[PDB]
Amino acid sequence: GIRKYKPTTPGRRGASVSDFAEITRSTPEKSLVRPLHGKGGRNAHGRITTRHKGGGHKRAYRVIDFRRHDKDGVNAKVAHIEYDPNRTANIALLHYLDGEKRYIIAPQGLKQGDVIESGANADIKPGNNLPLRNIPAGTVIHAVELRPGGGAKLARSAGVSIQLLGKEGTYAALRMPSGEIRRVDVRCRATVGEVGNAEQSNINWGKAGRMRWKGKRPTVRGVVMNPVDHPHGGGEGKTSGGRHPVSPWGKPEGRTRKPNKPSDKLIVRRRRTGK
């Protein structure tokens, strides 16, 4: 759920925080943690290539299993649900009967002690991962591969899910969280369920400093820059920019998907805008 802060200070008025109710353990698996460091939005040239990044809390990477392909038939039990800094969803530590320990995105409703299984023979129960071929149409799924063996790429953020609409030949038709309908190979893997932590979107961060903790630097509006800095810059007093809205690099607001991408053959229709 969401816990609302009391208005004891201007910075806290209106703000809220996760109740972290699903969290069972406060520390990660040592053997599944890798180091991570901040990039500040700078690339190999040391140039800022993504603005508004830097200054966030230090965090470590939990190795998430996005393939789940080498454990068909080996059941696992959910040992813990824990917080991950690197994504909106929570993560579930699985103990396989192999004695292997792996992290997976925690689906909605998955509790400690549940049994999870993988592969063609698995039951259609939240957290079970199996080829789309064996997933009946109409089911809600997440963490879907784009290419067989490529690893889960779609529907990974907290609360999101994909609906498997149907199967025809080698392809399954999927409705994306965005609403776009697209085809994927039926050999591609998916996990049954929605993604957990769906309440996170309702959090009111409350104050500038908390976004700084999350690594977001301030965004200066174009209209308050000078012409040399931004096409919207300039003018005496307040202005609307003095021209059609453009990026800081002058690109107009239009479609930016490249024409004639090969994936255009797999896309049935694009998302609808302003429905």
Partner 1 sequence: MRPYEIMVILDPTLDERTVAPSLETFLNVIRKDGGTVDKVDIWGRRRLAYEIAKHAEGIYAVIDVKAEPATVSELDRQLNLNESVLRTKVLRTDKH
Partner RNA sequence: GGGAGACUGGAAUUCCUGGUGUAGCGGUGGAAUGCGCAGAUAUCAGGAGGAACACCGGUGGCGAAGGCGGGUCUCUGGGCAGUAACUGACGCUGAGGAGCGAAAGCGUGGGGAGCGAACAGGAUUAGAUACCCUGGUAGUCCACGCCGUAAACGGUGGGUACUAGGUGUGGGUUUCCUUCCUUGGGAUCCGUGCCGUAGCUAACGCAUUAAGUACCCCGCCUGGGGAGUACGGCCGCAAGG
Partner RNA sequence: GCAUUC
Binding site for partner 1 (CB under 8 A): 123-124, 136
Quote the tokens at residue 29.
């698996």
Q: Smallest gap, in angstroms, from Cβ of residue 175 to RNA?
A: 7
Among 202, 239, 247, 263, binds RNA (CB under 7 A): 202
Quote the tokens at residue 71.
């454990």
The two beta strands, 91-96 and 76-82, are antiparallel
Among 50, 86, 178, 201, binds RNA (CB under 7 A): 201
Q: Taking a C-beta distance cutoff of 8 angstroms, is the pair 180, 267 a contact?
A: yes
Among 60, 163, 205, 223, binds RNA (CB under 7 A): 163
Give the integer Cα–Cα distance in Å for 73 and 121. 8
CA 43 to chain centre: 22
Please give the residues from 81 up to 120 whose contact with Mg ion meets the rule CB under 5 A.
84
With respect to partner 1, which residue has the nearer C-beta, 59 or 133?
133
Q: Taking a C-beta distance cutoff of 8 angstroms, is the pair 172, 166 a contact?
A: yes
- What per-residue string of b and e applies to 187-204 under the rule 16 or more CB within 10 Å gives b? ebbbbbbbbbbbeeeeee
15 scored as a contact of RNA (CB under 7 A): no
Among 13, 52, 57, 261, binds Mg ion (CB under 5 A): 52
Please give the residues from 158 up to 217 whose contact with Mg ion meets the rule CB under 5 A.
none
Residue numbers of the site for RNA (CB under 7 A)?
163, 165-166, 175, 201-202, 269, 275
Residue numbers of the site for Mg ion (CB under 5 A)?
52, 84, 219, 221, 237
